[PDB]
Amino acid sequence: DETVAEFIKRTILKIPMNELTTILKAWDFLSENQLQTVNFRQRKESVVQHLIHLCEEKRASISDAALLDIIYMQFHQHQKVWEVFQMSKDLFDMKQFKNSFKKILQRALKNVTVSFRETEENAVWIRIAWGTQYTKPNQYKPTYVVYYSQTPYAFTSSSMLRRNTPLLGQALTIASKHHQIVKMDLRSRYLDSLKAIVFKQYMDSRIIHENIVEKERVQRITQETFGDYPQPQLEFAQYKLETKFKSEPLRCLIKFSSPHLLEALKSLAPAGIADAPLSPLLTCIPNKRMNYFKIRD
Amino acid sequence: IDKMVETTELMTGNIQSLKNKIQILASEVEEEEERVKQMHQINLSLPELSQKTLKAPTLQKEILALIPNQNALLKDLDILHNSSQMKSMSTFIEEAYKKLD
Amino acid sequence: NEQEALEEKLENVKAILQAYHFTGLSGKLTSRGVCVCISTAFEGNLLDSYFVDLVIQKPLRIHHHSVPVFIPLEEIAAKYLQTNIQHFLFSLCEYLNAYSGRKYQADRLQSDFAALLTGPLQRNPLCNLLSFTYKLDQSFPFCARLLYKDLTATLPTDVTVTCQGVEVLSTSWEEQRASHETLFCTKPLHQVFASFTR
Amino acid sequence: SVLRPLDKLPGLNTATILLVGTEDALLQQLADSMLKEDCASELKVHLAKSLPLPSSVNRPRIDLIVFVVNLHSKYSLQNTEESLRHVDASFFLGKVCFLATGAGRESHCSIHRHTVVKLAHTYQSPLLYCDLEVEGFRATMAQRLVRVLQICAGHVPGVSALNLLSLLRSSE
Amino acid sequence: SKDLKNQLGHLESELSFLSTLTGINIRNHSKQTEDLTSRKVLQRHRLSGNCHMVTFQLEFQILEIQLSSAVTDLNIIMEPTECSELSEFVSRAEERKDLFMFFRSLHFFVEWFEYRKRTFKHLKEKYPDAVYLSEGPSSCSMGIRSASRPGFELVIVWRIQIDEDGKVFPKLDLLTKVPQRALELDKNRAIETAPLSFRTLVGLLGIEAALESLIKSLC
Amino acid sequence: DSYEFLKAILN
Amino acid sequence: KKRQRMIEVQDELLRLEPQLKQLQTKYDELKERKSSLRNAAYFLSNLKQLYQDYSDVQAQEPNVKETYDSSSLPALLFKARTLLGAESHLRNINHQLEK
DNA sequence: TTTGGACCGCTTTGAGGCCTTCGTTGGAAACG
DNA sequence: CTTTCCAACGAAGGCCTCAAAGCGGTCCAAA
What we know:
Chain D: One of its GO terms (biological process) is chromosome segregation. Chain D: It comes from Homo sapiens. Chain D: This is Centromere protein M. This is part of a larger assembly, with seven protein chains of seven kinds. In chain E, 41% of the residues lie in helices and 32% in strands. With 219 residues, chain E is an alpha+beta fold. In chain E, strands 1, 2, 3, 4 and 5 form a five-stranded antiparallel beta sheet that branches. Chain E has a four-stranded antiparallel beta sheet with strand order 6-7-8-9, with helices on both faces. The relative contact order of chain G is 0.04. Classes of the chains: A alpha+beta (297), B mainly alpha (101), C alpha+beta (198), D alpha/beta (172), E alpha+beta (219), F mainly alpha (11), G mainly alpha (99). At the A-D interface, strand 7 and helix 9 of A face helix 1 and strand 2 of D. Strand 7 (207-209) of chain A pairs parallel with strand 2 (42-48) of chain D, so a sheet runs across the interface. The structure holds a DNA duplex (32 and 31 nucleotides).
């Protein structure tokens, strides 16, 4: 098929050529001799044309291309925004789970391009390409869902899932043999930090400093609140507030943007910008496992 | 749709039946437990997971069937029972561990 | 004198602390709580130990822990974390010990007795369900499925072994089938495997 | 606790300086530039965030007061005028000085320099402009502060604090 | 030495807190270490300890290999008591060479034992005339007999057993010393199903309430 | 309860 | 619109599916409790009647001998199973206390 | 004087910023 | 009561830049 061929070509173009070999070592769809027939020192057009030749010599399909896309996503895992779904209310099996999920998504409207790829730490990665009742599913607007066996949490990349969100949720909860499924308001791009947060897996004596008690108290409070461990790499925060003025409630809306949050916030108190004890709205980001906040008096 | 709008429509109805069912049963058991409060008092401890009442408690009744002259064993154990020496031994032991508590 | 006596007392209490670590569980009291260390072992084989942080304040909270998430504790937390904390810790110790024993049996099988195995075993993170296939040498194929639905124990309650593609022809074959059934239902996995293979 | 220049007695050829501000790192670097070289008289450096100064029975004489102000933030200003209410007027007779940082970068100057100029002219106190970030400018300000300390401390015979105030006075 | 004494006291308080958290007090600990490389190291830890009512001694030699650990061997001594099943369970665990399950089982066994003894003392205190100490509060069975009529007696036997995996469970059974005179009197003959029925009653409403109702029926 | 026991032993 | 209808019907089905289970198990356990407590009331009343009848007859004739059958044999052997073990433990306790 | 080595040159190209397009409920407006 | 469009605007694909490194030319060390 030409569609799968151009899909594989686009995925390869997305892959940096410096690691394409690793991709093959992770893809393993093509024989190692075919890999040896291609040198990676030559031009990008030449290498992609040779890869097209190699995949056309074998039988190119959708499952192998989807697996390649999945493994590319694994190696990058930095180009999408992730949200977290919680299931609630004990026997598991991979094969029957896959069968049930596939059956539900086929029953969704008529068809959908679904691909599975088991990963270490029970990380089943699922690539889903949506399609309507009268069109083949599109491979240019995919979505990714990460499931952990026998766990109450799942991860989803929401690029176009706002079209049909309840369908994916009900399919996931029926496949997970769980009744209640909810979406917590927590959204971020560093997927590994989300993993850590959801599971909680994280001299010149002539100078006479004055107010040194204030400095030692503020540094101690900051250390006790944050800790010596490297804080999870979180990148976006937003609070929507509506509280009485006390100085008709004022409605406020703040967004914190930072390439490395929880560290500038860690340095605010030592820099003297904020008080020694920070407000609970900022000291419970890893504690409350909350990202979007609404508080009222 | 049909299958779905069939399969659920009965079960919820079943629910309703069971609902009133249990309600009636609840009322029943209520009055009935009041009856067992006529003489027994109203009132830590840890109950089992329905494992206490599973093994056979009277296996010994079978074991004694394997001993010879079971009736003669009863008779000789009775003629030993009336001996006051072992009664004195038992009461002496009782008195000995009475101060232990 | 006084320093020598203090040093002797310190080394005695340190030895007692080491002994406490070597049995049951461990706990190191800190400012914000106790980073309680739970120890795991099975059949005299030391296994990986975990730890969980505590908060001594009345709103009992777990701000940090190392126990894997697929072990259910939040329900057990609502059960006995607020009341009867001792039973809470004993139950979680039992559950972690059972999980560690199951994982040790599984990876011991994977590493050692893979010689007579004909395919990879499908295992859940909690290892409540096990499914695998094995060939024993006459040569007989089998496929076994074990249900460790009783989470507090390391022994399965229901095991089923069968084969597809071969019609029953030898009563002896069904005899080894039943023998293996009893072996899984009663005795540990690698133990019975080494028992019949040798 | 209102600070007084005439509370205790100083040490034998001893001089002391006080730096009050918000940026602790800048104060530490400035004190490092202060003590890069030591003159004949021994030098003591004190750093604080606000006034009144924390109580200490072992406090020596504080012969010089220097307030660092950043035009990058109004918070440093509010700090300066709140701290200014815990010192007697006698310090204002040449024992007080204002050092503005970042004035060169007019784009980064949050508050307008006219405000701090008016503030300094109101109290008739010396006003100095420097950039602590630049090592050369910081060093130059370092010998500047060391030598103004030498002048105000009375180490050199002939002038006093009011004399240097009449020297450093602005026309308007 | 004052700071060292304060630190030692704080550590002792922490150790006492952990001992309460485990219910076991280890009296002594002696450590020895040898290295036998072809890096195998053998460590021997002698320790005497005690649970609330029980005292025990045990030594074990363990092996560590450059990154696995396994106990080479162990010996362990109990004290002589009526509950000989404890000794055989100790032996079985000794072949199993398992420590954590052993200690949890011992604590559970003592926790059930303390419960049993306290309940026996409470019931004896409640009615001291219809309650007879056949062997003591720390025994396995109790017997209720009417002083006026010694023909009837009812014995409740309580025995704590250990599952092979290490699980612990109590068991309670009844038996009646009943003359056939009373059996001839009433033809209802419900004593045949008495054990199962009483077990169900206890499961429904506990042990202490069951015995209280039973002795109330004897008024 | 657990809190009262923990406080009674902590003292 | 049929796809939305799919959404609501599947949601209703998945919501109602668990609701059956807890009601079923509650009904079963309450029925078992009722049967058990009725049986237990019957047995306690019957044994109380046996006790009252035997007490009355014993007050009528206490001097008559009371024979027993094998049903009461094993527990009686329990008080015949005296091997000094309890008394030996008592002696050890006394020796510990004497210090 | 010839040959190899290392410098700087050049082109190639990988990644981030950013504009624009696609999708769009949600409300408004026309209506079988 | 229903349908379609404008709007609110969100979002992601695509354009565009440059900082990076490999290849190539040239000077200088060595034979």
